[PDB]
């Protein structure tokens, strides 16, 4: 399947949701890996600076979620199973700013 | 083995004990955050051809051998997992690492 940035997938880390943050050039390349940020259902992590709150109406996920930009994982592209949906441009911009903040970029 | 978890520093960690380069910003490094984000450092210098990766001489890092920062291999470790500190990456090579990270993460 086609792996794109800003997309949410289910993956085995247990089975949790992740947001693809690897750029689409590397996603389309022959690179076996894909970098992603973990999405938690514990909304209390939204207080942590840089993390991004995602309503369940936005992600088509069961519950409200939070992108934890301090929890970055490198997965095999094969580990990505069902796709959940996509994060809108505005919230993805918030995620980008959080990532630049936590990574000094 | 307490030291100070600072950016641009190289540590040994169990991912298999391998070296990692801290890329998490120092505000989060000083915070109570249990995790620390790092890029894996390989001794396979052939990965220096991969775009974005950064070659690190052993004279610069005080590492056993010449190494390469693989900016496509990013791991989130517990601050406790960082054991012996190896040294620090100069500002110029860390800037190259930053550019590679911005490229692979569209930042």
Residue numbers in the entry:
A (entry chain G): 1 to 13, 23 to 114
B (entry chain A): -1 to 13, 23 to 114
The authors write:
MazEF is a TA system implicated in the formation of “persisters cells” of M. tb, which contain more than 10 such members. All the MazF toxins from the family are RNases, capable of cleaving various types of RNA including mRNA, tRNA, or rRNA. To better reflect the specificity of MazF-mt3 in M. tb, the so-called MORE RNA-seq was developed, which identified the cleavage sequence as U↓CCUU. Here we report crystal structures of MazF-mt3 in its apo form and in complex with the C-terminal half of MazE-mt3.
